[PDB]
Design an enzyme around this catalytic site. Structure first.
Site, PDB file in Angstrom:
ATOM      1  N   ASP A 214      16.039 -59.269 -23.175  1.00 39.13           N
ATOM      2  CA  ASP A 214      16.094 -60.898 -23.023  1.00 39.13           C
ATOM      3  C   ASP A 214      17.502 -60.823 -21.945  1.00 39.13           C
ATOM      4  O   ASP A 214      18.821 -60.751 -22.786  1.00 39.13           O
ATOM      5  CB  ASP A 214      16.605 -61.226 -24.335  1.00 39.13           C
ATOM      6  CG  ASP A 214      16.813 -62.738 -24.571  1.00 39.13           C
ATOM      7  OD1 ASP A 214      17.264 -63.217 -25.449  1.00 39.13           O
ATOM      8  OD2 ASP A 214      16.838 -63.377 -23.336  1.00 39.13           O
TER       9      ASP A 214
ATOM     10  N   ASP B  73      15.716 -65.982 -17.126  1.00 40.78           N
ATOM     11  CA  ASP B  73      15.483 -65.724 -18.465  1.00 40.78           C
ATOM     12  C   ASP B  73      14.396 -64.800 -18.917  1.00 40.78           C
ATOM     13  O   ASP B  73      13.310 -65.205 -19.107  1.00 40.78           O
ATOM     14  CB  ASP B  73      15.598 -66.725 -19.169  1.00 40.78           C
ATOM     15  CG  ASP B  73      16.034 -66.781 -20.553  1.00 40.78           C
ATOM     16  OD1 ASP B  73      16.182 -67.710 -21.254  1.00 40.78           O
ATOM     17  OD2 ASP B  73      15.924 -65.588 -21.246  1.00 40.78           O
TER      18      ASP B  73
END
EC number: 3.4.23.15
Lengths: 338, 338, 338, 338, 338, 338
Positions: F36, F224
């Site tokens: 992430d 992201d």
């Protein structure tokens, strides 16, 4: 006579096939079978069924070499139905039907055509008909079970359910040796067979709404648990369908789905009584849209002598009327539902 | 040992939850409970459960303040199932199960997670397992019923029906002190428990179609009336599902709905009998569409030591096989349900 | 004239039936009715409708004996539509239409055929046509409401919505005494009636894409809120359908669903303006698959003299164009949508 | 008593949630709130709500630290609805509702369960009930608006629209100090409250089709703008649903979607008028498929003493009947919505 | 030759259209294109495409004025396919195909008919055919890319996937300069072209199950990535369909969906090998119901000289066999799947 | 700086979750984790997590008591994502990621909300963001891998595949220390980070079809890898969705499934290149039905200061564009994925 009954739970496939489990051999090899009052032989596919036939690669096969109760016979046989034909040879073994165990001669099937047996969700057939129509005069399974003297009564009964996508409910039930009052209401009324040897009764007329327009002066009705539909001769069905306003699409007879509920009741006059199906009973209301066509659960089938010409009252009829086949008295009992 | 049997009628919710009613207290406060051979404690939700637990808002809550026969204990307890946990404290009161009345220690639950308990039609659980696995060493309800010496046999039996859209169909039935011959046929076949203290037997193999491809050197089977499905270890189920052609999702395994009816048999070799399920028995057939996905009533559940690794045979299995749990002889008996 | 309007919310059934509530009697018995500019009588089924007719067992029946404002008349009447026929007798009572209350002579219907009234989701009909076409020259309800002098204008308007499975949105709305600008855009343009007594206008041509191929040299157009479809004479529709490339399936005209959007606009030339429906407006795109057939919302209907031969602009047209029926000026106003 | 009315525009989410905007603090922090006659407190989620409450992550949070007109109180409070509970503490600040500004004590909620509040489009609740039912004896917002003596009448009114796929459609509307004649027709009919302190009236009977089969010796009706559905006691709803042929699931009742449109009327006898819903009013008609299940906007809710047992008339009912809540005369008025 | 390949991911629309992105201009304007071995020109719709054509309002248009690499040509051209015709003018610009950039002459299309280009989900076409069949003898794009000397091999390959509602999986892939072994299994076998200039091979027979009933004595097979279906001459297809038992519904050839799996394999004899499609490969099993009709992915198309008469092996064939078009050796390689 | 690259194979769950395996401890305890770039901490669920957190029952739990290389820390931490929060405490142990072994401080999570974490196939998260955004100032895993001086470049790269029903398809891949040329084509194009410490770049405009209607004076884009979708501010997404004709629901935006394939392109102007998605890239096309609703992989997410307001480019975007994250040069590179 004894004091037992044996039931077998049936799977309903699309309201057109109904089948349940039997085991054959020691230890039992389990097959899916149609219990068929319209024939008299037991058969399943063989491990010796050459894999040319796609049907045999797609069904469970009986391996005689894996049963310590198998006894060889070898005598050949051809079983042919109104929609398809199978062929193979006779074998003896122990068959379990709802925890009744019975030594039974049956057909190991080695020729099994894709039309129609690739469409079959069942592996084989247990013929519930009489010895008179058995191929090879092989003693039918129910006669061999009657010989054991364990069954409370020399009858067997059929429940066929309506299919539902919102339930995992029973597809049907056969009871050997009696009936199950959970699946009918009221009391049986019986019609006697024209003659022993065939599950066939006299019919005194078929009305569409208000008028016996068909079978005036009488006709024959086979009660056939191995048939998906109610069937008539091609001419009877042409006239039935004109009366309903149904028409031959390409393959089948259809109505606009919205107009399905406007169609008249159909009553079969058997043994002084009227057995009435409503349109909800004989049309496949896959929808009720005015933009869609819906098929009917009634078809032509010209059955040849000696059994035909005859109507056949198959699953479409049986869904409506729970059916008791009474061997002791040579008669068929009906009761509604449920 | 006396001469009583009591039956409890169960409700079948969607083939996934089976529960009946008990009464706790004076006057009785009624609760829907699962009778669970995979756990040994009784609990129901408590009036002391915070209503920030939405599950408690949606279930029946035992209120001690309304029971004149309540006796305080207050000992903390936590109960862990494979799919969720409950916590609260111990209380004693009079419990009626099928017209048997017993003084019983049970859990008043004050912490009841939304997942899974918002999805429960039942309120609580009656553990039917052995004292060995009882949390807090609380005497299980069936041990306390035995101590009254009213029951004919030190046994209880489960019948789980198939789902129905009919009101008339009995969802299931537990018999305390015997078995109901009306819901099984043929003969019981018995397997001894690996050990007393758990309803777990030896399983000799699992076959999928025409191959013993799983549990080939033996394994364990928990017979679990409180589980909806058949479960195996993750690795066992991965292999099982590879053979069925099923796709893994978050919480279940699916096949294309048109593929369901033709999936292979699955057999469970238990104590010298093969126990065979067809696809009709383990597929939730909701459609025959090639575009839709249909869930199987088999899933992965890794149960830890000392009980696991183990398969668990729940409602998917019990629906086909009437099950008797024999405490006198530390064995489990199966017969074909009807 | 007064200062009020009255609206009635309509249910849309499958884009083919549109109906709303009226109450009849003191206290009001509520019925579902089609508001029909193509007829001029009010009728509902009677409590005296013999239950031979399945239609009467399946609809709400008016019981005169339960109303303290009922007054007997008895005079018989037969009302026949282009698709079906009803018959019964005249009664007087108070009818509530969106909280306007009006004393009205109407038909209590005692003969009600299954074809088509078993397909009817509505109980009855409120005729919004003129007295000139009323059976028994019974004063139509809108004339009796005009007589009260409460309505802001001597007009009434219709909104018919497109059906949606993702909304519980209004099916339609009738406004007595005016219009609702929430359901149309812009300003009305009006076409004068050929003659008072029928809601029928002159049409100056019907084009399919680029060419007035139909109704050159003029034709008639009934604006019929009681008709599901746009209709033409059998010959007009045969030619329209050939131009579109649509063909008669068995019962109806169809196109492949994917080709629906390739079909040309259809424009009706009324009062110097072109009222254009696109293919999205006149084809039931139940899907857009190249593997599926889709029906059109246009049908043949040979309407006999004196009213026909004529086109009929029913719900298919009205969905596109909000419609104002102007009794004071003998004209019909249209506006788009919405 | 003054000369002001304020209206608040509401959003309709899926016919199940109706909410409008308030501003709290200086500068205003805006919140979506349900105006709820079934509760008497104002609350919104707090910035002090732990973000382990996912509901708080997904809603607007009042931050006291950003408001210059905030006044601390800090008293704990818990609010219990039939479907869930919220907890937090009391604060005071300036609240604007439709251009009325009022200083108000409200709940800052710090415990906000995922079920049901993850499913809320709204953030909080403005209780429109009486001080008698206010938790912590906090003065309700409408009492504080009355004390300003700006409102024309001591009344407020609710209009709840049907769902729409259009942007232009107003979801609903609350009028403070009057009623909007643009959203009702005919005349109001009034029923007096059993007692001041609850928006509950006497109900004289509930009829399903052509039979008063429920509430036959009178019962209670809460008029509840904060409830989505009509609710009754479990036993009342079981009976109601038996008559509709509906199946009970976990959280709702369903019928086959093709059956929906032809389900019977349901009438509610209130103060000498029958208030009738058709199936279009209480079925979420999403399909006409015989294979699909369609939810009814009626459910079981057992409300305890002193308020219950009671029926609750929520949005299902209010959508059809414009509702006025009269605090001056302690009565509720209904008129036909438009 | 170089050392690179370029791949382009394709969208599958309903198994009948397959298209991917190219960019044209500096900066790139992106279009959806079919990569078509059955034609040799590149074209997209023009910003100068008059909005009379609904097709041009519904597709992306190339604006030459917004590209700093655009160079005018103006020469007109008409491109006509077997199902539709386009027309416009030649322009030069930079085209990006999977991050290969190539200066290319292409058609800006100004005449674009609703039949069929309103049904097109793609904007334009990239012709992968030879210069011999190019209109205006415009150098085809692949020849211009070969001229760059960057591609590892002078071949390009096609993968076309089967559509699925349960996956967002790739619709297909074209690889310029080689192949992707992830999308086929085993090794290519190649068939040489009859002559350079057309992607057409000799076919040595077409069998339906067990019998080469078609194309005995040879016939031609175009391998056409721009065609949805397998096509034959009208006479070949009439005979193929009779052999299958398929029949012309109204527009298309259908079978009952249940009987789809009973239909025989179809083998195309190419280069000493048999390329076999099963019924699952050539029938659109939108369902498997006995109540429904299913269409086949095979159609008649009479292709005129000089290219025809010929069979065309389009997406139906390509889904089964991954295809490599080898320009260096004038041959086509096939491999299964996957 | 050394000469190593390690790749980690990722699993694609439903195109919404992409995760790979790490091992923590001695012996290794394996976990499924999302890598992430939108967060900078590592966490996995802890054995100290109460089993009243059902999410913990359903995930793999780190047990410190089984790891010989564990080092206690115990500092509390809470991690907040836009869709939920986790809380627990810090521990140190050896972590293996793709055959790199690193000593790492990570969170043992003891509070793990049912929503969203019951819906996660993954167990935990490996933050790939910068130390600046690390909660508790814990050194991020990639900083600790860099300090070993084994990696060829101070970069890592992400490949996210499209979903597949095939086992053979790689779900995705992270490369530590480089990029894999096998999964991109053409050249990287680089945008510098606004600032080091966040994987955020300047975005120059967002266009929907043929109009720059959004981000017209520039905006922010977070790249992201831990987000499923593309997100924008509520106001940006409202405008975006108005242009697509999409309907807002609780948690997503939908269009009619038949409308999906023809929705316009969306382009993102980043560092002097336009990055274009077609409807195939951002619609979950599950059906082509006009009656069904199809979700878009774009949603509203208001990220607060200092990072927001910002768009976030998640998996919807990364699936089309292979992404390289360059820590040496504080930039992000994009190339066309293959």
């Amino acid at each position: 006579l004894g004091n037992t009954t044996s039931s077998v739970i049936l799977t309903n496939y699309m309201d057109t096939q109904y089948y349940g489990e039997i085991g054959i051999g020691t230890p039992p090899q389990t097959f899916k079978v149609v219990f068929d009052t319209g024939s008299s032989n037991v058969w399943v596919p063989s491990s010796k069924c050459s894999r040319l036939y796609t049907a045999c690669v797609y069904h469970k096969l009986f391996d005689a070499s894996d049963s310590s109760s198998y006894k060889h016979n070898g005598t050949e046989l051809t079983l042919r139905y109104s929609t398809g034909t199978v062929s193979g040879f006779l074998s003896q073994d122990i068959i379990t039907v709802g925890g009744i165990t019975v030594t039974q001669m049956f057909g190991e099937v080695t020729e099994m055509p894709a039309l129609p047996f690739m469409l079959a969700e069942f592996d084989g057939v247990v013929g519930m008909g009489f010895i008179e129509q058995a191929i090879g005069r092989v003693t039918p399974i129910f006669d061999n079970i009657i010989s054991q003297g364990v069954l409370k009564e020399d009858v067997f009964s059929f429940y066929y359910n309506r299919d539902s996508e919102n339930s995992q409910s029973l597809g049907g039930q056969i009871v050997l040796g009696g009936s199950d009052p959970q699946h009918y209401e009221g009391n049986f009324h019986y019609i006697n067979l024209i003659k022993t040897g065939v599950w066939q009764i006299q019919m005194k007329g078929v009305s569409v709404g208000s008028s016996t327009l068909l079978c005036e002066d009488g006709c024959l009705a086979l009660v056939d648990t191995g048939a998906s539909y109610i069937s008539g001769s091609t001419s009877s069905i042409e006239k039935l369908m004109e009366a309903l306003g149904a028409k031959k699409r390409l393959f089948d007879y259809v109505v606009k789905c919205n107009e399905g509920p406007t169609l008249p009741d159909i009553s079969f006059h058997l043994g002084g009584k009227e057995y009435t199906l409503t349109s909800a009973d004989y049309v496949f209301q896959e929808s009720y849209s005015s933009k869609k066509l819906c098929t009917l659960a009634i078809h032509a089938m010209d059955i040849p002598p000696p059994t035909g010409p005859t109507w056949a009252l198959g699953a479409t009829f049986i869904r409506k009327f729970y059916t008791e086949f009474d061997r002791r008295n040579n008669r068929i009992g009906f009761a509604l539902a449920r």
